[PDB]
Amino acid sequence: TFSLADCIPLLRKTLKDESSVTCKLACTAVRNCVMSLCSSSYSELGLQLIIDVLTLRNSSYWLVRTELLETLAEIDFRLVSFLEAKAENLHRGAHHYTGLLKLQERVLNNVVIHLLGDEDPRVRHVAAASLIRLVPKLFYKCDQGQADPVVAVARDQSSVYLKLLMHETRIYRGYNLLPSITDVTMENNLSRVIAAVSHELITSTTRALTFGCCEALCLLSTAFPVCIWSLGWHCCTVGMATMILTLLSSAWFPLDLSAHQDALILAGNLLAASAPKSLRSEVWPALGDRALVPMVEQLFSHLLKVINICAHVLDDVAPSLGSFYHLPSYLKLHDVLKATHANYKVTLDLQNSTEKFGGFLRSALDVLSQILELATLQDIGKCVEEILGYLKSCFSREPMMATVCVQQLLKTLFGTNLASQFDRPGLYHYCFMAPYTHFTQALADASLHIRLFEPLVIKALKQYTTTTCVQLQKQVLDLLAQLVQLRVNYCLLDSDQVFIGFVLKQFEYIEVGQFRESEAIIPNIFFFLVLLSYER
């Protein structure tokens, strides 16, 4: 005679447990069944569980707070908004409340974004991760794409099953030239989320909130690129570049290696998103919008200094465009980076990927390479010499991104980069009419200055034959393929043809399964060879 509704009181009782161990396991149990309950005839019980877990954000146990963040990320708020709209006595609660539950508002603002100011960096990382997951599942009224939550829910069901079965010089990561066709609903949800996170950034009195808000914004620029979702990042756009560049030119924010490298990625992403509209066809002459020139100039100059510091730290030498001695703030950053690398020197955790000095150097080289797309030979040709000198110092520590940075310089030097190459819907629509129209339409169509690179190039060739990192190895072939594409004769690179022999001898291990990650390097190896079939 057992009834399924008998653990709903049992789950609520264990949620308010005096022991943090039981409370964490009670939140995990809620996580398993919260979405199924909201999708069933017991929807009022699933909605009740959402209300009861909201009090866990004040728990002293960090594992409980992260469990709550993971639990709420599972919740689809298009379904919750539908249940909220037709719930009458559940808005009152146990004390006859006079307003509305506003579960999405409280989860988004009082939990997900509120926990971005947590003292534990682990809780901030989970809160940021749960923010990206929630963005596609948020519902707001007066939306062009979905008037009511029922249409919003039906959109997701029909977007997978009714998806019609059909099929059909390299710009850097954060650039998008062609006009993307973005979802208007997704633009609105992203725009609302970004504004809420942006508001907390300036109105922040704690370092933790600033650290967590920048990390969340940086992750949003990766999941939802600024160049693709231009309308979701405020009115092509830059959004909050000056918002973030203020923290870069601060006294305490740069000293946090985790948040400093997150701001660098976000700052470069925002500027790169305005590329097609801010190019033309002085300093930085490719930028048609002169309002962004100081923004690009400040970011570009900042990166060279932090790269110089990493070069100084790696070469353990005590402290013109990348000079940092005459700035006390950059001197403070050097002491932080010096200590972090000194820790790395005396350890042997080769498989560690969360190390801060290496990640910061990777991020600094990542953004510098991205910024080089909006550059011309005129405005960098005078400053290409020390950057190549800087890359040599950091090549041994991060050879993968140093090669990427070298490639971007070659594009700018040879005029290859982007800067040098430029010129009502309801259920009926989503469920039947739009899929039918697309399907029937497809049926109808069925009837019918270089010599400076050479010291840094031979290092890549030398390191290719001595490493087991396929990511670095496949990056070298990309550089080598680009050099051949730039009509640089292969005789200058492989003087004795010792590199090509190494590549050919690598196939013996590849085709007997003795190469650990041969699948990653094969596409680049063969493209490099077919490019070499023309060179004589």
């Binding site: 307003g99 007066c142 633009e187 609302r192 918002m243 006390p328």
Partner: protein
């Protein structure tokens, strides 16, 4: 060089000692030391941190233990320190940093029973952020409008709400961008409630207010349920239908914020008991 670090060490030592009246003064001494070396970001942080300590002391004496004998004396020193850092930030550029500090001072003033002073600082922050961050300026302006309502400056709040609506349409359009849509909804409801409360004559009825009122005689970015109730409220007020306003006041309660609910309560109260007769 060395004096600044020692003063900073003294400031944090007294902070752990909870003698922050002198710790913030020590944090002002290091700011003077930073002035001798012209360390912009260093001086800004020192003046900023000293201000937060001064805000805490005023908050401690006005929120934690609400001592009657307090007369906002730590607040005066906080404003001088925050104002200096705002001035220093502006001189070396960074209008956003100075505007953020103005928001911090305004937030403290609002939370210490000084809405009129807080509204002025919130408007100042919006002006600084407007050239670069229209969205941040609208948020600062929204805080100013709330402060003006706290200070019972209804026409002052109406001017701010009208300004925010005009800026949101200009910088966020057609159809809004989502983030600006929430601003437009807040302005549209608040302006109608304020216009119904004040009831400007045709001489004072600006074209911006007249166009908005004509819309309520389509829905834009306002929900249909709220738009119809807002339409009914305007007609009920103009026809002096007291019973309709009472029914609508209850019905619109869950759909409005507490700030908007207070404005609706004032509209109903003014309809039944008009002000200005002396009785």
């Amino acid at each position: 060089a060395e004096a600044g670090e020692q003063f900073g060490q003294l400031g944090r030592e007294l902070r752990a000692q909870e003698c922050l009246p002198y710790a913030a003064w020590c944090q002002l001494a290091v700011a003077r030391c930073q002035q001798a070396l012209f360390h912009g970001p260093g001086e800004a942080l020192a003046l900023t941190e000293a201000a937060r300590l001064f805000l805490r002391q005023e908050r401690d004496a006005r929120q934690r233990l609400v001592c009657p004998a307090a007369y906002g004396e730590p607040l005066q020193a906080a404003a001088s320190a925050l104002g200096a850092a705002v001035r220093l930030h502006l001189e070396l550029g960074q209008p956003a940093a100075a505007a953020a500090l103005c928001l911090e001072l305004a937030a403290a003033l609002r939370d210490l029973g000084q809405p009129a002073a807080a509204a002025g600082h919130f408007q100042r922050a919006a002006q600084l952020q407007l050239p670069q961050l229209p969205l941040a300026a609208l948020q600062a302006l929204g805080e100013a409008a709330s402060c003006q309502l706290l200070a019972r400056d209804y026409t002052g709040a109406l001017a701010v709400f009208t300004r925010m609506q005009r800026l949101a349409r200009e910088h966020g359009s057609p159809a809004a961008l989502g983030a600006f849509s929430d601003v437009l909804v807040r302005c549209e409801v608040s302006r109608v409630l304020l216009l119904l409360l004040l009831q400007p004559p045709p001489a004072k009825l600006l074209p911006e207010h007249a166009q908005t009122l004509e819309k309520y005689s389509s829905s834009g970015q306002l929900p249909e349920e709220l738009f119809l109730l807002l339409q009914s409220l305007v007609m009920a007020t103009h026809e002096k239908d007291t019973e309709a306003i009472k029914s609508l006041q209850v019905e619109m309660w869950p759909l409005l914020t507490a700030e908007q609910n207070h404005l609706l309560h004032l509209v109903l109260q003014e309809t039944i008991s008009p002000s200005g007769q002396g009785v």
